[PDB]
């Protein structure tokens, strides 16, 4: 019952031999400012991956 | 290097030419429609909408990035994600690049033949407006050139860029060869000056500085009409030289490889007439014409089928492409003479009457304007 | 996120495109040469009057090379003058060998660099080339580094 | 668990197929083959396993 | 030599050489869409307006194009046509004229399900059921032979055909493959020779005393490069007579363009598509030889078209036209000119009625004669 | 050093062209049938059977292997070993190679002229079906080229492969010449660097690795704009060079040998226009047409007499081979004009009447559609 209990996908070519997927992340913040300001907080991103066989 | 082909496109004007000469000329060639009551109002509405620059840009993005989309917003009293009821009406169209479209909802019902085709498109333009959704009938998607299905499915059913790595490196090394040729010309002749004990002087001191200044000064004033004096026992002054030959032929061969890999020929890619022949560049024009026409039926026509029914109230029509041949009044002057004598040199003996003879003569677009009538 | 370098290494010009400041509302008393330190002798109507550095003065900036304001080759008396108050700049020197990186420079008479053992002030930035049987160094000028003695 | 192809999946790049029969003296040999990868869990924490029931 | 038991040659290499190299793209792609877009005409039908209407309603010619493309590349392709039939998709088709779509699969997606070799039927040896495994997570569905059509590539030996389960071979055989491959090698060597035209040698006795990777050696290398960049025709360099010598060596370069042209000519010969089409360069020295070159090219493409384009037509037509007996004509694949088209229309219009006025040839057939050859002269249907 | 021709066929491309170019064009040329009441139903029935792919590969394998067979099955109520009764029925045709056919039974009757010709053919297709026996009239055998009889009866009365030893090794030598030319180009220049004591340095150790890495590094950065340093007392750096000339001419000579042995000329085997003349490749083509028709008359027609009487119920008929010449619209219209004016310019005064003038005009293939009648 494996093929009927878990989903089956076909997004993989018969010649492929390893696969990989990606993951993202972010950081940031904000403040209360005035009209004449020259500094503001910044944001960024991140990334990661995993493999298979 | 330059894996993002957009930078290459906006940097090197050559790739610009290869990517934009074909589709834009294709659309500017024009077309004509049959089965309509008339065509003057057709043209009036057409240039009233005046969307052919957007069409040009859509085709260019499809050819370059491998994909593009256009959304046609229609004046209807329904929310946009819903499908479209029958009718002939339009108020605007706008084009999105390959990066702005994703699939949202998919249908797999076996009853309809549209299973495996997206129904809902997620469009995310940006500009601090929320990404939204489009029904399939409202949008049209344009692709580039065909690619193996294994690559097609990993490119989420989208085509490939026309600037493949072979053409990229062929473009890249040509400029390198040109710079090398400039260096070859720079290094044609060299002068060598040898002085006993020249190594004795300390580094970066006044003596060495004065020696260098003297060398530069005497270099500045030498020539055919000027001479130099030296010391026989200590110093000598010699010259070495090398020849240059074949470099223009190397550059020509590299450019010819560019032409062969591109597929568009010389009098369009290097924009230089061969000059040795009078009436062969014309046949080059018809070879280019057959190439552009053949690429035309594969992509320009689907745009016409997608958009044309939304503007014309007429039921059944035909779309026929104007023959892409650069005309010449004189030549069409005898063309019109031939047509006018052929159309009625012999119809005076058959049932071919006025209301069909006039239609025949003004179907072939003449310079003769004819009011509608009997 | 990086700072670009500037191409010609001549005396009197700027060497980088880092944060710099150019005080262009000044006039000269006497004659000044490009790449020399200057001092402020007085202020009239929001304009600073500058002269070449004497003994006992506090340097304020370094004369800056321009190809429209100074057609002669140097700055002349009664001319509007450009002065660099903050940034990296090529200066004339009488030294023979490069000093330690990030040391403190000392200015002899006429606005030339002759010391590398100062207590406080401008600092050596790591550039040392040769000009005209003399050398050129690279100095990092900061705005409030030298303070006028009471 | 929660059933969705975004959390767990099983890939079948190659389907079952039969190679042509290799003949010998008076008998044949017919091989078969396929490909698989097993179960892959991209998003854990959507599965709970209660043990020792 | 040892080799895997699951033989697969035209699996990855052909696809890579197609989607990476450009000359392979051209050599496999110039033919099919030209064949399909040359156009065709039908005979035995009441009218042609509705024929073109149904054709540009169905809009299947891009599918035909890339179907023939995969047929030429992978050695095999299939197209399935869906019919408006109220039966299970395993069942055959009853006689009729109806269809709702045509869609294409590659060589990799079709296999045989069960085989019939009945003696009385001439269909022995012919796989009667095809098992197709589509992509995008769709379960396989077996098909009766009547619905789908299989298109092959080029002829091979029957010994190879049976080993390749009744499927042709790729046009990109290894001879053409490595002929394409070594061209880039020759080009790279040509560029390398161009770089290596001239060299300079600087000899300093005692240079061996220099320490490796210390300030002295770095200073020497900086000075050498610095004096190198500022040299030229208008500049001179000074050296010491006792210690150092500065010589220049040079070599000649010639014949490289001819050698590369010969390599391209070999590519043309193995390709079979001639110069002004594969290299797209007009020879330039002659006025009207490209016309005969291109008519020979149409000879090639027409003799290839008669082999593969027709079966698609004979497979699709019986499902679209209710008329019982029709024939296919191929339009003459030669581009004609407003000038000469006007001239030929004049010629045929006066030939058709210059002398028929004395015989029983009447209007009701003269009109069919004049509008049979597709004119620019329209005519409303009538007497 | 003898190799089976099938591997060479399905591996090499020039062999593919040499073996394949003639039969496919030959069969696609077409034909016309005389004595027939009408030709529309003839073509309808012909492309209903649609046997031309089988015909193509039958002729191809006859050309290659020197022998091929076709099995033609008929609507009849008898076993396959029986002869064929008079009639016109056909239901299918299939093609078998050289290796699956043998002779079974012998006839030597002096009464019939059939002595010495096999009467029963023994087919062994294999693929888990029992080999069977077929009567003579149900099978046709296609043979290759003529051979001396002392080899003919040694080869069971069968032809030989068109790829003979001279053709095979002439083809093989060309690739060797190309590889040698590539080597010649690669060995144009050589740099030699000699250092006193270099032999003292030992094999495969760290010092040797460092030295050779340094040599590779310095070689990677040499060129026109860069110089290298040398120690005068111990080491010397020289360059040796060689010239290249005549290689394209030698390759052209080898291609000459290939075309001379093949027998099909250059604009068909190399497929390259001469370029220096505009109107000589036309007579080149007509020489090709003459030779291909000469070969066609020998072997393609036997298929026509083998199969045609089995489908046509008419007692008498004839085969005419269409004039194998490319037909250009303009000249076709001109020829039609000439024919129509000749056919009735001078028949107005004699007994040449309409019922046969119509036959004459619609026999010579016109574009002139005309309904049958008086």
Give one DSSP letter per residue of C31-46, joined into a string: -B-TT-EEEEEEEETT
Write down how long chain C is.
150
**Around E275, how many Cα atoms within 13 Å sit in the side-chain half-sphere?**
23
Burial readout E305-330 (b: 16 or more C-beta within 10 A, e: otherwise): bbbbbbbbeebbebbebeeeeeebeb
Between CA F292 and CA F21 the distance in angstroms is 10
Q: Is A11 on the interface with B (CB under 8 A)?
A: yes
Which chains contact A through at least 3 pairs of Cβ atoms less than 8 Å apart? B, D, E
Between CA C139 and CA C107 the distance in angstroms is 11
C-alpha F349 chain-centroid distance = 53
Q: What does the block give as tokens for F86?
A: 């008079």
Q: Which of F24, F241, F333 sits opposite E347 (nearest CB)?
A: F333
Contact F189, E193 (CB under 8 A): yes
List, in sequence order, every residue forming a beta bridge with E342; answer none if it has no partner.
Answer: none
The residue among F60, F83, F16, F6 whose CA lies nearest residue F262 is F16
Chain B, 167 to 206: residues with Cβ < 8 Å from chain E are: 167, 173, 176-177, 180, 184, 186-199
Interface mutation vs chain D, best among A12, A20, A22, most D CBs within 10 Å: A12
Whose structure tokens read 């024939």?
E327
Q: What does the block give as tokens for B31?
A: 């077309």
Contact B139, B70 (CB under 8 A): yes
Specify the pairing of strand D28-29 against strand D22-23. Answer: antiparallel
Contact B67, B158 (CB under 8 A): yes
Q: What radius of gyration, in Å, describes the C-alpha atoms of chain E?
A: 33
- DSSP conformational letter for B349: G
Between CA F268 and CA F292 the distance in angstroms is 12
List, in sequence order, every residue forming a beta bridge with C141; answer none if it has no partner.
Answer: C87
The residue among F331, F320, F255, F256 whose CA lies nearest residue F293 is F320
Between CA B174 and CA B15 the distance in angstroms is 13
Angle between helices F281-307 and E290-316 (to 10 degrees): 30
Chain D residues within 8 Å of chain A (Cβ atoms): 3-5, 8-14, 35, 37, 39-40, 42
Give the alpha-carbon dihedral of E262, E265, E271, E275, to 10 degrees. Answer: 160
Sign of CA dihedral E133, E134, E138, E141: negative
The residue among F337, F328, F307 whose CA lies nearest residue F139 is F307
The helix/strand/coil state of B309 is helix
**Around F107, how many Cα atoms within 13 Å sit in the side-chain half-sphere?**
14
Residues with Cβ within 8 Å of E60's Cβ and at least 6 positions away in sequence, in order, are E102, E316
Between CA B99 and CA E147 the distance in angstroms is 38
Q: What does the block give as tokens for F322?
A: 């269409």
D–A touching, 3+ CB–CB pairs within 8 Å: yes
Residue F183: enclosing H or E segment and its boundaries? helix F165-186
Residues with Cβ within 8 Å of E256's Cβ and at least 6 positions away in sequence, in order, are B246, B250, B253, E190, E193
- DSSP conformational letter for F160: B
Q: Is residue E66 packed enough to be buried (19+ CB in 10 Å), middle (13-18) or exposed (0-12)?
A: buried
List, in sequence order, every residue forming a beta bridge with B31; answer none if it has no partner.
Answer: B321
List, in sequence order, every residue forming a beta bridge with F73; answer none if it has no partner.
Answer: F92
Q: How many CB pairs under 8 A join D and E?
A: 11
Instruction: List helix spans (H) across F192-265.
Output: 206-220, 247-262
Sign of CA dihedral E272, E17, F16, E66: negative
A contacts of D9 (beta carbons < 8 Å): 6-9
Q: Is A16 on the interface with B (CB under 8 A)?
A: no
Contact E111, E131 (CB under 8 A): yes
Whose structure tokens read 């699956």?
F100
E contacts of F9 (beta carbons < 8 Å): 157
B–A touching, 3+ CB–CB pairs within 8 Å: yes
E contacts of A10 (beta carbons < 8 Å): 135-138
Between CA F317 and CA F309 the distance in angstroms is 9
Whose structure tokens read 């904000």?
A30
The helix/strand/coil state of B202 is coil
The residue among F70, F72, F68 whose CA lies nearest residue F92 is F72
Burial readout E74-113 (b: 16 or more C-beta within 10 A, e: otherwise): bbbbbbbbebebeeeeeeebeeeeebeebebbbbbbbbee
Q: Could you tell me which chain B residue has the CA closest to the CA of A13?
A: B150
The helix/strand/coil state of C92 is strand
Q: Inter-chain contact D15–E163, Cβ cutoff 8 Å?
A: no
E contacts of D17 (beta carbons < 8 Å): 111
The residue among F157, F223, A21 whose CA lies nearest residue B177 is F223
List, in sequence order, every residue forming a beta bridge with F235; answer none if it has no partner.
Answer: F195
Q: Is E4 on the interface with A (CB under 8 A)?
A: no
Sign of CA dihedral C61, C67, C72, C78: negative
Residue D32: enclosing H or E segment and its boundaries? strand D32-33
D–B touching, 3+ CB–CB pairs within 8 Å: no
Between CA E191 and CA B336 the distance in angstroms is 56
Q: Phi and psi for E271 in degrees, rounded to 5?
A: -70, -50
- DSSP conformational letter for B226: B
E–A touching, 3+ CB–CB pairs within 8 Å: yes
Burial readout B122-157 (b: 16 or more C-beta within 10 A, e: otherwise): ebeeeeeeeeeebbbebbbbbbbbbbbbbbbeeeeb
The residue among F160, F118, F121, F125 whose CA lies nearest residue F143 is F160
The residue among E9, E10, E22 whose CA lies nearest residue E184 is E22
Q: Is A15 on the interface with E (CB under 8 A)?
A: yes
List, in sequence order, every residue forming a beta bridge with B33; answer none if it has no partner.
Answer: B319
Between CA E13 and CA E32 the distance in angstroms is 21
Q: Is D41 on the interface with E (CB under 8 A)?
A: no
B contacts of F225 (beta carbons < 8 Å): 183, 187
Give the alpha-carbon dihedral of E309, E311, E316, E319, to 10 degrees. Answer: 150
What's the distance, Cα to Cα, between the start and end of chain A in Å? 23
Contact B269, B291 (CB under 8 A): no
Q: What does the block give as tokens for B106?
A: 């998919």
E contacts of B173 (beta carbons < 8 Å): 191
Q: What does the block give as tokens for E14?
A: 């052909």
CB atoms within 10 A of CB B338: 18
Whose structure tokens read 């064929």?
F84
- DSSP string computed for F272-316: ----S-SSSHHHHHHHHHHHHHHHHHHHHHHHHHHHGGGT---S-
List, in sequence order, every residue forming a beta bridge with E250; answer none if it has no partner.
Answer: E198
Shortest alpha-carbon distance between residue E296 and chain B (Å): 14
C-alpha E290 chain-centroid distance = 21
Burial readout F325-363 (b: 16 or more C-beta within 10 A, e: otherwise): eeeebeebbbebbeebeebbeebeeeeeebeeebeebee
Burial readout F15-44 (b: 16 or more C-beta within 10 A, e: otherwise): bbbbbbbbbbbbbebeeebeeeeeeeebee
Q: Is B214 on the interface with E (CB under 8 A)?
A: no
Write down how long chain E is.
383
Write down how long chain B is.
374
Q: Could you tell me which chain B residue has the CA closest to the CA of C133?
A: B206
Between CA F370 and CA F362 the distance in angstroms is 8
The helix/strand/coil state of B72 is strand
Contact C114, C134 (CB under 8 A): no
B contacts of E342 (beta carbons < 8 Å): 335, 338-339, 342
Q: Inter-chain contact F276–E285, Cβ cutoff 8 Å?
A: yes
D contacts of E136 (beta carbons < 8 Å): none
Interface mutation vs chain C, best among B201, B209, B213, most C CBs within 10 Å: B209
Residues with Cβ within 8 Å of F161's Cβ and at least 6 positions away in sequence, in order, are F5, F64, F65, F66, F144
Write down how long chain D is.
53
Residues with Cβ within 8 Å of B93's Cβ and at least 6 positions away in sequence, in order, are B49, B51, B54, B70, B71, B72, B73, B307
Between CA B371 and CA B364 the distance in angstroms is 15
Q: Inter-chain contact E66–B240, Cβ cutoff 8 Å?
A: no
C-alpha E182 chain-centroid distance = 21
Counts for chain D of helices (H) and strands (E), in that order: 0, 6
Residue B320: enclosing H or E segment and its boundaries? strand B318-321
Shortest alpha-carbon distance between residue B361 and chain F (Å): 22
- DSSP string computed for E262-296: HHHHHHHHHH-S-HHHHT-----S-SSSHHHHHHH
Q: Which of D3, D11, D42 sits opposite A12 (nearest CB)?
A: D11
Q: Is D19 on the interface with E (CB under 8 A)?
A: yes
- Resolution of this deposited model, Å: 3.5
The residue among E238, E223, C129, E246 whose CA lies nearest residue B218 is E238
C-alpha B67 chain-centroid distance = 15
Which chains contact E through at least 3 pairs of Cβ atoms less than 8 Å apart? A, B, D, F
Q: What is the experimental method?
A: cryo-EM
Between CA E56 and CA B122 the distance in angstroms is 29
D contacts of A8 (beta carbons < 8 Å): 9-12
Chain E, 275 to 304: residues with Cβ < 8 Å from chain F are: 275-276, 283, 285-290, 292-293, 295-296, 299, 302-303
Q: What radius of gyration, in Å, describes the C-alpha atoms of chain C?
A: 15
Contact E73, E107 (CB under 8 A): no
Sign of CA dihedral B344, B348, B352, B356: positive
Between CA B259 and CA B274 the distance in angstroms is 14
Burial readout C112-148 (b: 16 or more C-beta within 10 A, e: otherwise): bbeebeeeebbbbbebeeebeeebbbbbbbeeeebee
CB atoms within 10 A of CB F320: 9
Q: Is E160 on the interface with D (CB under 8 A)?
A: no
Report how far apart, in Å, the C-alpha atoms of B357 and of each of B317, B350, E362 are: 22, 11, 19
Between CA E353 and CA E365 the distance in angstroms is 12
Between CA F231 and CA E297 the distance in angstroms is 63
Q: Is F53 on the interface with E (CB under 8 A)?
A: yes
Between CA E104 and CA E70 the distance in angstroms is 10
Between CA B261 and CA B253 the distance in angstroms is 12
Counts for chain E of helices (H) and strands (E), in that order: 12, 11
Counts for chain A of helices (H) and strands (E), in that order: 1, 3
Between CA B70 and CA B140 the distance in angstroms is 6
Shortest alpha-carbon distance between residue B234 and chain C (Å): 25
Shortest alpha-carbon distance between residue A27 and chain B (Å): 20
C-alpha F118 chain-centroid distance = 30
Residue B53: enclosing H or E segment and its boundaries? helix B52-65
Between CA E315 and CA B75 the distance in angstroms is 43
Contact F13, E268 (CB under 8 A): no
Residues with Cβ within 8 Å of F91's Cβ and at least 6 positions away in sequence, in order, are E122, F73, F74, F75
Q: Phi and psi for E181 in degrees, rounded to 5?
A: -65, -45
Whose structure tokens read 């006193």?
F196
* The three-state (H, E, C) secondary structure of F71-123, written as one string: EEECCCCCCCCCCCCCCCCCCEEEEECCCCEEEEECCCCCCCCCCCCCCEEEE
Q: What does the block give as tokens for B249?
A: 């032929």
C-alpha E196 chain-centroid distance = 39
Between CA C11 and CA C34 the distance in angstroms is 7
């Amino acid at each position: 019952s494996a093929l009927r209990v878990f989903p089956v996908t076909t997004e993989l070519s018969p010649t492929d031999k390893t696969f990989e997927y990606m993951t993202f992340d972010k950081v940031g913040t904000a403040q209360i400012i005035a009209d004449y300001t020259d500094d503001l907080p910044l944001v960024d991103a991140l990334g990661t991956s995993e493999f298979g066989k | 290097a330059s894996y993002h082909v957009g930078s290459f496109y906006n940097d090197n004007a050559t790739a610009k030419r290869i990517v934009d000469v074909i589709p834009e000329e294709m659309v500017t060639a024009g077309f004509k429609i049959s089965g309509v009551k008339d065509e003057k109002e057709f043209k009036s509405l057409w240039d009233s909408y005046k969307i052919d620059p957007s069409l040009v840009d859509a085709l260019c993005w499809a050819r370059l990035y491998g994909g593009a989309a256009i959304v046609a917003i229609i004046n209807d009293n329904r929310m946009l994600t819903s499908p479209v009821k029958p009718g002939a009406k339009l108020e605007g169209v706008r084009v999105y690049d390959r990066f702005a479209i994703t699939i949202e909802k998919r249908v797999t019902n076996a009853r309809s033949p549209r299973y495996g085709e997206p129904e809902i498109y997620k469009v995310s333009p940006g500009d601090n407006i929320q990404p939204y959704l489009i029904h399939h009938t409202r949008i049209f998607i344009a692709d580039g050139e065909r690619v193996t299905p294994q690559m097609r499915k990993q490119n989420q059913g989208w085509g490939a860029s026309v600037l493949n790595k072979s053409l990229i490196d062929a473009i890249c090394d040509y400029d390198y060869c040109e710079s090398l040729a400039t260096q070859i010309l720079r290094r044609k002749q060299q002068a060598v000056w040898k002085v006993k004990g020249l190594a004795e002087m300390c580094d970066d001191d006044d003596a060495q500085y004065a020696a260098r200044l003297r060398l530069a000064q005497v270099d500045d004033n030498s020539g055919v009409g000027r001479a130099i004096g030296i010391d026989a026992e200590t110093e000598e002054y010699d010259v070495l030289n090398s020849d240059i030959s074949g470099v223009p032929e190397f550059l020509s061969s590299k450019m010819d490889r560019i032409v062969s890999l591109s597929g568009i020929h010389e009098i369009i890619i290097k924009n230089k007439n061969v000059g040795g022949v009078s009436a062969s560049q014309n046949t080059a024009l018809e070879t280019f014409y057959k190439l552009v026409d053949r690429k035309r039926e594969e992509d320009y026509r689907p745009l016409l089928e997608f958009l044309l029914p939304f503007i014309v109230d007429e039921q059944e029509w035909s779309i026929e492409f104007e023959p892409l041949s650069v005309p010449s009044k004189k030549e069409e002057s005898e063309i019109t003479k031939n047509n006018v004598e052929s159309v009625t040199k012999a119809i005076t003996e058959q049932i071919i009457d006025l209301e069909e003879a006039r239609d025949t003569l003004r179907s072939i677009a003449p310079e003769f304007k004819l009011k509608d009538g009997n | 996120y990086e700072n670009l370098f500037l191409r010609p290494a001549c005396p009197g010009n700027i060497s980088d495109t880092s944060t710099y400041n150019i005080d262009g509302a000044c006039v000269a008393q006497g004659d000044i040469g490009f790449g020399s330190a200057v001092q402020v002798v007085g202020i009239v109507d929001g304009v600073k009057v500058v002269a070449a550095l004497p003994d006992g003065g506090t340097p304020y900036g370094i004369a800056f090379r321009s190809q429209y304001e100074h057609l002669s080759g140097k700055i002349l008396d009664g001319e509007v003058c450009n002065v660099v108050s903050h940034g990296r700049v090529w200066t004339l020197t009488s030294l023979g060998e490069a000093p330690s990186l990030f040391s403190k420079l000392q200015f002899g008479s006429g606005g030339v660099v002759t010391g590398g053992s100062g207590s406080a002030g401008w600092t050596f930035a790591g550039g040392f080339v040769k000009h005209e049987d003399g050398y050129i160094i690279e100095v990092q000028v900061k705005q409030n580094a030298f303070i006028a003695p009471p | 668990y929660e059933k969705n192809p975004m959390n767990m999946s099983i890939e079948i790049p190659e389907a079952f197929n039969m190679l042509p029969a290799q003949p010998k003296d008076l008998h044949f040999k017919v091989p078969c083959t396929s490909k698989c990868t097993g179960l892959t869990i991209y998003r854990p924490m959507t599965i709970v396993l209660i043990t020792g029931v």
